[model samples]
Target: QSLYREIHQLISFKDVLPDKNLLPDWSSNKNPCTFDGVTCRDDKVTSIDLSSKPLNVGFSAVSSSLLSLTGLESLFLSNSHINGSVSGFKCSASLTSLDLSRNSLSGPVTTLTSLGSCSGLKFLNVSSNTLDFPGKVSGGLKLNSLEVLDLSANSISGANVVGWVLSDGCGELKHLAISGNKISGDVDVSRCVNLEFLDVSSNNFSTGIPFLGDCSALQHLDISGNKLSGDFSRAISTCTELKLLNISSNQFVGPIPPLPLKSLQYLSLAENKFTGEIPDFLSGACDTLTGLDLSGNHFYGAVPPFFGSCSLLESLALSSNNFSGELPMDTLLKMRGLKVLDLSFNEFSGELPESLTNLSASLLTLDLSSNNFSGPILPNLCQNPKNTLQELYLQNNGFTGKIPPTLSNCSELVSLHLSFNYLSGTIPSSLGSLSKLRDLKLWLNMLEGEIPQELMYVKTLETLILDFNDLTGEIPSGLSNCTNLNWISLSNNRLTGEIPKWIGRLENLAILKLSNNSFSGNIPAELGDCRSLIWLDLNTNLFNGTIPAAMFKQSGKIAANFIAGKRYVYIKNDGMKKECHGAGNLLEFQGIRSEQLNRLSTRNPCNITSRVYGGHTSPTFDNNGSMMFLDMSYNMLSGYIPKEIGSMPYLFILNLGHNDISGSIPDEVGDLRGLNILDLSSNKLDGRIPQAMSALTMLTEIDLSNNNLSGPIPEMGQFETFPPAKFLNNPGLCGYPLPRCD
Candidate 1:
């Protein structure tokens, strides 16, 4: 009974759990097994997993408390934010595994040597921590019994980190991963004889090939994203038992080498300098080859005909190459089980063969975008009733003719992209039959006629892009049935009618683009009900009336994830009134050359200067909310800038230019710590710019031009980042960047 009481006092340290005990169960019982995180055998604690607990204490507190339970075999406190050093802790011979990954655990890396005396230690994973290892690593980590050690994604830097990890003894070590770090200088691993898996990927390792000429038992090895150079063949030649190998994005150069490894199933030689025709030995291993990627390289000429026999190959990517000539479909058909085929960004030209439909049986994703393929899209492309194709991308080609209505036969289709082609025929109403459709992009085509109301039948619809088309008529009313809609881009069209009130009912609507259309109506107040509205654009339209105050109700509670991911480039507008369109270039979906912008009446950002941004946008609020991008410029909208607009602290871009809006900028806008672009130019009246605006230091681009504002512009924080042109024509606004105060 006294043992548990001693354990309780040690765990509930005043500095750690000072906000009263989160462990009320520990206080309710004397049996240690009755504790939340404790596990016991024969009335003695053997395991403790507190991974989910929020702790404020250092690792020192953890060290002193947990080591007291001698019987404990495993202690897992990953992602617990355990800071401080690995000091004041003695040995626990019974402890076999300790996982402190994804924590704030900090200190010198070698401090882990303190566990040297714990001879029973087997698995230790301390990844994603803030520990550093200063100076050279000349001595061995003294843990002889350690078998699996993962120090990846940490701040561990300095010389010879690889040497220190493998120093002295690695007798029992089997799997080691030290990736996602700056640790370099690795040409060793001679001691890890029994190693089967080694991932040193995404590191600054510029050294030559790892001395892996020894381990014949190795099965998986990833040395990608390094600066090493050498004949990669000789490095892993002896390790013929390897099943997976990735050496992509390195400085390795030379003709494609021979690999006689009969057991290899996956091989990625992408983004390297490896050149020349495909080696025969690689195709000879077709019996086991299931996936192969040779993208982003200098490899040219016809794909080897030998691949015809590699039927087991499921995933093949050969994009961004100089491979030309009509596709060798006869040989491609030989791979009967191909699941994903990506041949984009190549010089291959010619009309697609009708036999393409036969390949759809087992294909899930087929991307042939960014090629010179012209002529009508094969009508029989999805003729096979048994097709299970999901994502069919044929964008950025010279293909003309109407979109094949037969595509409706692909019952399992999710995304269908046919943008940037000369296809001019009207959209097929049969498309409404696709029940599993999620993304339907037909932008930049000459398609005409109204949108089919029947499209509402696709309950799974999320992204519907029909920009730069000649289509007319109001958005289908029944589209409200698609509660999963996230993007609705219908710009550059003759589509007329009031913006649908039911659009606000789409709970997942994150981006709603309707610029350069004939849409007219009061901004719907129901838009505030859209819990996920983050980016809203309605520029160059005929919209009028007061800016609804209720529109900002969900300002701080938005689910931004609805607009994240997916490839896009937000081009900053050139600020030339007649030259460009929209408050900002907004997003001109990547993949095709939007150079069609100049020839076509509409303008889309197609210049080379814009940066492409991937990855999802993360919400910073505790409840995770806030609008990010909003554009309502070049409209007849008139009214006071509602005070509620300042509620969006997570806003990044705010453009209200060329409108009839009149009022003082709200002081509450100072709360926007994340604003990067602010454009309120070409508006009616405005009082002195709020002094609180000086706190927004993150502002990079600001445009308050042509407004009737008075008093000196705030000279602090972000005003110096922009030129005087950004604040031009403001009769009463004076500043150092403009004309100095009177």
Candidate 2:
């Protein structure tokens, strides 16, 4: 009665219900089992599975009321809009499993110690939440009966024992996983007697091999992304019954030893110092193996034909190794179950084998890139009509010959990357029927002919790269219909035509590269409608026009897509008027839209809050504003700097150096607070640098070198970061950073 009384006063359950008034179902006579997602055993409620339900209610309501129900055995309120600390959760002695995964639950780490009295606890999954643990788990935790525990992807940090708490008193623990946390400590596996599955991957654990000989019953152990060293095979051999072992991305050295577990079906020893031939014992000992990854190692030897007998192999990754010798043609013809084959970055020299068609029927991802395989690429790659191969990567190979039109057979291909090969012939027009194709790369080839209009049928295509090719013809008009295209590169091609104005209609288009082409005509102002465009390189082309004003509207939203960590750069011809982009310098901008969309997909059952965002239909800012360079320098452009340019907070390199921009610089330029390099040289502007521009505190470079400006430069914050040449060639711009205007 007390539990019911407390909840009745705390939650306005009736206000959120379909009917906005309290009903007779409020008391014990109403039975909580009648509630949504509530399961009843006998007359008492035994389970509550309200995951992903927008239960805008807090945990306090459940702790003070629902959890007090001793008849409850399982409670799952994951991602149900449940927020607040776990302090209020009163234990239910009958509760055996609690899953609060993917919830907005936030609090300190040791929050579960309060549940120490729930002796019946067997499965505890609190992953993908916002809770933080300060490393160590005190002895106060009351989980003695826990058998399965998963606290992955949480904010738990500090010491390594954060995940080791299960072995302390959780005697019955069989499965323990605490990955994606910063648990930096020695993984001592001796105490976990019943631990059958242990995964502590993606942590900061840096140490030598810890003994696991006592964990004989371990069936699956994954310690990837750690700094543990020592013989990789020795640590895993401790568990003779192990079925899956993954120790990738560690400092472990020495030859990978043979495992005694005949039942091992999955083994990943990638990114280690294990040298010598891949021990033949792998396929010999475990004939039932379905997956083997020996990538990123120093293993040097011939391709093992023994893998053919283990036809159960579904995925084999031996990339980035010294494995030589041709992949046996017999093995390729017999391994019919192969779904993913990655033999890239090897020295295996061989001609195209027709036997590849045997496995092509079931292959989903075939990556033979960065290899020495020569001769005509087996046109039978997509020959099998029943094939489900979605990704085919064969770039940087020594293959020669025209592309076979038969490739159109693989209708399920989502990404077809065949660049950096000696293949010729025009792109197969029939490939336009591949509606599921998202990425089509055909760069650095001798292919000729026009891009097929049928390609427009690929509405799902995100990247279209066709650089350094002899392909000729006008840009296809059907391209504008592809609303999903994020990148469009066509440099160094014989394409001759006017840039289409309709290209601006693609709101998702981020890149538009048309340099080194024979394109001629005035630049379209309608292109400003492509709100997501970040990089616009039209140099070395016949494009003639003034900078459109619409480009500035994109300034405000530029930082929205800037990824936190990304590297590698692709610069076309040396800082020339018309740069010639070859390849490999594209730093992709990861969008934030996916993150927000994932949150809106929850279907929890507790509370119902339909307010999807702050309730305004303003299009997301800077849809394509994530950029480090803006190279429109050589275009026949003439325009004043738009005042809206101030909003590009992350503008790193602004190169309007060779453009014909005229008119006084807008004082609003002061708004570029994060400007690192600002080049406005060779512009026909006349006036003093705006005194308001003194506000650019983060400025590192400012070049007005060839402008007709004349005035006293502002001696303020950013003025010192510039050189004299930056302000040189100006009629009369003087500043302290420029020998002090006297």
Candidate 3:
């Protein structure tokens, strides 16, 4: 106890909390241990927690001075910009937990091997660093009693690293996580018998799931996002106490195993090819189950109504399956605690049950999108205070109804998407009270009216898409204050007015589409100030003025960083430009939780084939290059296809159709092997379509129709996949599909 007093006085670290309103002094001076996230043993400074500290200083100050504090058993200096190596680590003999995660600690981590003095350490987290070849454990990696060790997100790799950690000295290691690292060779956790949590996800583990011969104490095992494969049934079943299991994004096959584990609660098997019907045992089994994610599989047949029998089931994800038939409403009512239900991309058909209202007030996320559901929406579907509903998406369905004002009653609603439906109603002024609303997608509907000014009060609103509606009137000036707004799509609406200058004030706005509206005025150059503006489609309107070159830089070179997590928009590689490689940058919009696969489904529509293959190709633009998402379609762009475009390897969707460009289809276009969707249709091109175009083997959808190309269609791998209409209007093109030229 005197040593603690000496250290506290030695460092002048008396009651000085950085930002927390920690009470002054200790004991009734307020327990030093009572401070949030800090732990002390017997009134001693056992740990120092600066995790998530907003300071910009590095760890050299702490390592050289504080590491010598002998009584300090645990130290959590995460995300405090702890730079440099372990050059100053004096090796605390009493240390147990050392959390240097999420820091700028660069260079070789072998310095960590020098912690042999900390033999009593039970927790060591050095994840999220730019570690170099970390195979050689510098000092000592094995603390016989170590329980939790996380070296994830480092550059450690090869079989030796894996072997070194699981050696005899580490035989007692229970919780091991090496995920998000470059670890290689095979991984075997069978020996870590006491192991409970093993996460090796997002690595290059080509071997199958690690064997768990007698790891009966195992509870949470995640080997997702790796190349591992093999029968998941075997690896599991041995872990009787398993609660959280995620083998998603792996090469696992076979049917869902008959896991009778009573404690299993969270399970994820997404991005795998697990075929056949879900095992029937899963029906009344898993009594403690609360969340189950079996999406991204090839499971077929009707969804088993027996799942409703899981009394504790709350979230059920069955998306991307071959499952057909209407959802069993009666079955769903069994699980009264259900909150989030996702049955998208299935063959489910039937009226949107007004009875769906039966889901207890606990329901939050109801995604029945991409189904064949049809019906008039229930009036008070979202009216119930029981409606903790945050997102109501019935898009891509046949739901028809007038815009129910009752929707406004769902005050907590953030995203209300009824797009691609037959709903008709005026913009409800009452909707302004939806202060928490962010995305109000009423696109492709029969709704008609001027946008209500009251909508401007939704300060949290981000995406206001009313596309293909009969809406009329000027863009609301009050909307300019909705500073969080990013995507404003009023395309094909009957609105008319000058492009509001206030629209440019939205610094975060990424997409502003008024195409097909009656807007007439000079293009707003101030729009160039919106740092996030990526897609600006104001075409088919009266906005006539000289093009602004500065507009492009407003959202500098649409690079991978822009649309990284976007769902449906694919900026195809420009087939005609070497500089046009790379996927189009997606503007980051709020209110959409589109995972990478979900994004693939959105952009590629054709689904897996589009995403898996299309995105794999190299970007047309240089790494971190610009200019991939081209928008020359339906424009008067008269220039010839730029050869620089052939370099854009990342371009996945290219559209040059309807342009008055007169030139031969550049053979450089073939260099764009990553092109997934190409549209050169309705262009004034002349001469034979370049035979080099045959190199576009990845082309799934091609439209060179209505071009003045006069020659036999080039022989290509998937050209035959296209319809005759794609090649029609080419006067001189001759081939097998068209009669051979004699």
Candidate 4:
């Protein structure tokens, strides 16, 4: 029926079919050989399975309705959001597989030489599109039966247009993925030679490792994150049919080579700079190894009792590296099909090897976090496979006593991180019977009593980090029945009463850290019914009344940014300098992200002196919201600071220091134009400091020290760059670095 009326007028002229029931199953009153991803034989149209049909249609309305379907042979539109140019893609010389992978397809590569005139195209998946390649290399147009050419993550660069698309595929290229293309020089696929699965990973391609001269029919080789350094074991010992090898994050340094893949089964030399140890030729692919990622790297001593001959190893990622003594646990109890064991950071110390519960019956994710494993904590940790422990990362270790209420015997635990350790007693209310527990991070430890209303029987709890610790009472009104709580770090802890108005029914409470707790009354106006409260640290608490004007209405519109897009690990010091005698140390990273800051030089979560830095910003709540970090510093919190906090247009770091907070600093704090580090120090806060705070052009660190804060201090933008000891002992404060302004 005119080829189903020309594919229903090119899918209604590319109105992009987001389901008109996939165009009434392409009805020309049915039978275009029974449509729906058609594959007709005699009635003609051979194969057109629209893989993942969002079909935002393009490529000139699907190459003008697939060039009148000249017996279209296999043309599955992968991730069909297809957009423009394949430079008038012609196809159909019985097109043998042309999946436009994850589309948004663009142009150039000499308009893909009109796909080298199809000539029986053997699989050309235009992987993750953009396509541009042209830095010389003109003539070579022949496809010579292009056998699987996925122009991976395109924007393809020069260096002779990927050896001119593998020199016209003469050697009939077999599976070549031009990885995340920016494609640079020195990549000589040694004249293709029927290359079997070769991914030129990430790609700047620089220098060494590229003469796959006789890759002996290569089997899956990913030249990972590239910038290729020297000694790639001479094109990897001539790839004796390598079975899956990802030279991860490359810069491949010396030693550790000679992985003569005896049909190796998936091996990723992670974040390479590879040094000695762990090479007994990777235990000669111990029975077809199943996934081994040598993490980060500087691979030091021990850990190479060569995985008791790997026994079909199931995912072993030796984390960070510098692997020290202990922990080979008899080569992981002879790998009885182990499942995901990542020895974190590494310096593996004593204890923790009571045969680690013999790989807890096919372990499922057990990351021995930043190791130095001391005593206790083997409350039969999942006594021989508690339904296959799922994710139990023993956080910065030094594991002391308690916390092992037999860890609710794993019960398919879901994320239980024993935070920076020194673990003291309490907190083992049989882990509230772990009903699929979701993220219970025992913050910097020394864990004391309370907080365990049997953890409100873990109804799929979502992140409850028990802060620093010496934990005292209150805060466990059956944890308001943990309705999927979203991060509640009970900060520093001497934890007394109040602060719990059923935490305003947790509706996914974004991050509420009850800072340095002594937690007295008031301050719980049902926390403004937490419409997703973003990071509110009730500083050194003894919290008195007032200030809760429904928690400043929406304290700058709380949408929550408590480290949004989260991948934290910032552990900078200066915190807790004699508990802010210097006004600095509010250092309670109990939501613990300090990944092995040099195994915290002699113990530290908050015992200070740490350094590690990972990052992750990207949390802004346009239309003015996203309460960005408010620290009610050293509190006995009295009145007036809330001018509805100038409708919170992303208030960045406001610390109401040493408070007894009296009035008059508000011209709505000049609508907080994203205020940066304003301290409002030593408060009783008398008048005149607000010349609408000189339009806070993102003020950097203002303290208004020992306040009684007075007059003429408003000298425009960032208040004349503070530091006259931040307007010291504000006795009717004047100007210029504090003495002038008559």
Candidate 5:
């Protein structure tokens, strides 16, 4: 075991960890090869795979120690938080593979160029690092035997890193990836005569694409998410062996050219400037095609009728194109292996052919939304009794008639969206049989009758949005079983009766919108028990009660992940629309035709464009959780402002206006550092504006109008920023924005 035992001290690992706790087995071992993560070959260590360990070691120390591992062949030190690097560290001649990704390591340009001396190294991965190259290197790397080199998701100056890597000649290279960088200028790969796989995606590469010197052997190429354009056809004209090509999100223009590839399995030309009709050979030429996407382009005209020859075609997306004419059932039904088809955002019209159901056995997702397709939903829209049909999106169409109860036959259905259409009649009670359904979005339709009690058994239900419908009767008491419900948007409905108290038990419930309903009874204090309830909108309801202090019990404890990342629109009540019933509307539903929101019965239509703030709820600071938005306006709720409301440090909008709530604005409201909109107008509150409100500098909108608030408004922070209309009818109150404290 005396290979190079000048000292037993671990130079790299000991830089951060002084004790033997980080490497107890390595110290306890008498034979070095027997130590964990050390691979032995004939009593000599050949590999070290210390991945996923909490080694807070630096790159330089690692190079000094691990490079001296005599005959080490491979090294895997990923996910160990290794940071920083040094220059010109020599490498062992036998080291062939080195992976240090997932560490977010940072290094200088020289640190990488120096590693080029690992001439025999075949594989090297340094992704997820921050190795910046501010200047160009004078000499190229000397890694002669390198075959596969990956520097993805790492920092690099435009064209420098790529230049240096291939500078040593890529004659023996087969695979190369430098994705996720700002690599500008020309990418010349003409020298790599044997390059088979190249991924230069998510970069800043613009201008012409250089053709490979011998691309006949190239099999996979991805230049997506860049501005690369000119000569795209010539760039890969020689790639006869090309199996996959993705050039999406680039500025590439003109019609797609016929590829020389025969075994092409996957191709995506999405989000490019490609225009005119699709090539006729795209379907017939590459009969081995498994997937194809031409979405987000200006492509028009009919799909090639020759698509029938692609027997292996499984997925096709022509969405966001100008394609028109009747449904292409004749050409589509021929592909028996089609699994996913998306023709959304097209002008395709005419009734859905029943043959669509015949093309159904293998179809997992069929999205015809945002199209001109018109017809009664097929009763047997789905086929294959024992097959897997997971998603069906027919929203924003002319589909009419009753919900097909037979749709429940797809026992594996997970999502069904049929909103924004001419659909009518009662929701099929048999839909409750979809036990695997997780999302049921049918809002803005003519569906009537009470929610089926059978839905209670769908334990996987996460989002149930049936708003703007004729749904009647109280919420089914059986819904208590849906403990996984995250969003319950039943607003603008005829549903009556007090909200079921069992709703408090749904610990994962994040958004509960019962606005514009006949829901009566005291606001449930038990709602506080809903640990994940961040958005509670009961505007224009018959609920009346004291603002419960218990409602904020779970404040700051709700995980932000539940409410964060949800698409939402907050219609702030600027108190300008005098006819508006409530202060504002804060609706958070998904996949609904937003143009029809004015038809919503909130009685407070938000037409003020500037007052509307829409975005996905992304929280960066409040990771521990807190209620972010609340609206109870236009309700009969009468109570004191709960001081516990201040516990919600992340609460950005609050609307208690039009309620009978009486008492002073609690001084604790100042604790809400993120409160952007505050509305207490048209309330019975009567008291001095709390001096604590002076520090609320984050207030972009405030309305104390029609309240009996007295005394001078605090002058320092946000009081004067708002208009005098905000203080109107508050006769006793006076401030700079209201004729001063006269």
Candidate 6:
């Protein structure tokens, strides 16, 4: 019937169709190729695969039900979470393949160059669509029998969509993906001679490199993270039928020429600035190379052992290069299908080469982190008995002795990074037999006794980094059965007892570091039942009681604000300073700023120091809570600061300072306008300092110094720039710069 009454009043399915009797049998006594994603021959409806059909219709109900199905050829509406406007897509006339990929399809991409008047339109996939193009293409609509044109991950950009794909009906373009588009200048593709798969990778295309002259059917070429640079040997010297070549993070410097692709199989010249000595015609396409990335280059000497003819090399990324000696271990034991061996931040020193335990049964990810590799870790590394290793990064490396407790015979170990190694003895409780371990980094090793309650039999552990390390006792109550513990850094360490309240049943605990460590008792009201706590560092511990008002319940759902999704080091405790009081200074959050703050100030363990802060402000909560960062300062914490600690409102940093806390600082601490740092100093506080702390406009740092506070220090806004020794020895803390409100 009029095409099942135009697809039952123009589609509108937000899922639930698998069979509503195939929607009343798409009418007219059925047979639109028996409906359900219709596909027919002799009678009509020639193909219409509703891919991932959630089908929330509106490309004007797929152009008024396929503009009268001119004889619809193939129209796969991919991931149909469909949206508006393909403005009257008039198709057919033997329409050949038109898949609107991952759709939320928006308007104008010249409405798909008006389907180039279907001169037998050959395959056009509107990739991950939102489509917006136009900055003068001198008049669109021209698809010279287009051969595969995927407007990839679109936000399609100007330079007139590259002059409407080099106009006049795109001379038989063979597979052209405008990769994550923005499309800038100078991309000629040397007159698309039947271009074979060319992805203009993440663009901003700064001119150089897209002039593949004499492409000769270019075989898969990606202009990697583009800002395109020069000296790409006259832009990929006549393609030579390249088999997957990604010009990685480009800036392309000199001396790394001859990519002379002998049918190259995936080669990424990584983070470029290509210096000398990597050449040997790149091991003449090591017998059809299988993934080789020359990482961040400045290529120093000695790496050329020529990957023993690559033997189907399965991934070898020579990381952050400057190459250095050693590690050619018989040219990596002749490749033998090596699986991911990244020589991390290289300067490859000696001792890791016990022919890397003869590639432990087809190595599966072994990154030698930061490398300068000292001796003694090779206790037959993972002495393959059909090992099939799974991620073992030897961190920072200087790798001394011990730790090779035959790594519990690598029972398919998943992530074991021996952190900043100096590796002394004692952690080998046969790594609790690695029950599919998930990240157990032995931080800055020196490893003494007591953490092994047979590591609670691993239970798929989730990151338990034993920080700095000297390792003493406590904390191994069979690790409360590792409920997939999420990051528990045992800071500094000299460990003692009682912090465990079954660690509040882990529930995916996010970062709980037992700082400085000598851990005493009482602070665990079952750690307010964890609920994914963000970062809680029990500073210089020796804990005392009375601060857990069920840890401010859910400090309004854990201080509800957020941004950090990784890279944290936030230490900050500058207390007890008379010329530097150890324990506090390591900030490095890493969204920005961070000049290695004196290289983590002598590996921070209290002579505090670090600086660099950038980011954090804005959040009066509309939902978002995950306890940001709270240090129970040089602990001995006493009572009353909790007006439910203003329900966390994104608690930036709150140190209960050298505690002994006594009443009155709570006007619900003015709902913590996301405080930067607020130390209630030497506590034993009196009253009067809360003029709702002048709404804490992101306080930079405020220490109620030796507390017992009184009167007007609140001249508002980050409190009139603080600094009278941060409201010093506060007993009647008068006004203006302190000592004036008489």
Give the alpha-carbon lDDT of every model: 0.80, 0.70, 0.69, 0.75, 0.79, 0.74
Q: Write the per-residue lDDT of candidate 1 for residues 577-679, one digit (tens) a residue.
A: 3645565544446455444333343445433243334333443554568888788888888888888888888888888888898988888777788898888
TM-score of model number 3: 0.72
lDDT of 5 at 607: 56
The digit string of per-residue lDDT tens for model 3 on 106-223 reads: 6665566655557677888889977766455443345457788888998776554665677556567789888898776766677787888888899888765677778688888888
**TM-score of candidate 6 relative to the true fold:** 0.34
The predicted structure with the larger TM-score, 3 or 4, is 3
What are the TM-scores, per candidate, against the unseen true structure? 0.86, 0.85, 0.72, 0.34, 0.94, 0.34
> Candidate 5 on 413-456: residue-level lDDT in tens?
89998977777888887777889999888987889899889888
Better of 1 and 2 by lDDT: 1
The true-structure Cα RMSD of candidate 2 reads: 9.2
**2 or 3, which is superior by lDDT?**
2
| C-alpha positional error of residue 249 in candidate 2 after TM-score superposition, expressed in Å | 1.6
- Clash pairs detected, candidate 5: none
Candidate 6 per-residue lDDT, tens place, 560-673, comes to: 223234454544445454433223433213121233234334546334344333344333444466476777777787877767777776777777778788998878777788
What's the lDDT for residue 512 in model 5?
88
What is candidate 2's lDDT per residue for 1-742, written digit by digit as tens? 3446434532444344343232334444355657666777665667877676666766666676556666678988778677776773557788888887887777876777666667677888888888786545545345667888887898878664643474456457789888998888666656667889888898888865655756678888899988887665666666778788888998877886667557788888899887888766666643768898999898888767776687788888988888777766677666767888888777777887776776777889888876777888787766757878888888777778988777778888898877777788888887888889888887767888999898888888887888768889999998888888867888767899898889878877766777667887767777667657766666556666666666656554543242223221233233222232211124221111111222211311112133222221122343445444465555567767767666665555566667678888888778766666676887788887888888887676567878899888787777776667677788577766565657
Worst 10 residues of 3 by lDDT: 585-594
Give the winner by TM-score. Answer: 5
Give the candidate order by descending lDDT: 1, 5, 4, 6, 2, 3
Candidate 1 Cα errors over 4 Å, as ranges: 1-48, 55-57, 60-72, 87-94, 575-579, 588-626, 639-742
Candidate 6 lDDT score relative to the true structure:
0.74
Quote the lDDT for 371 in model 5.
76
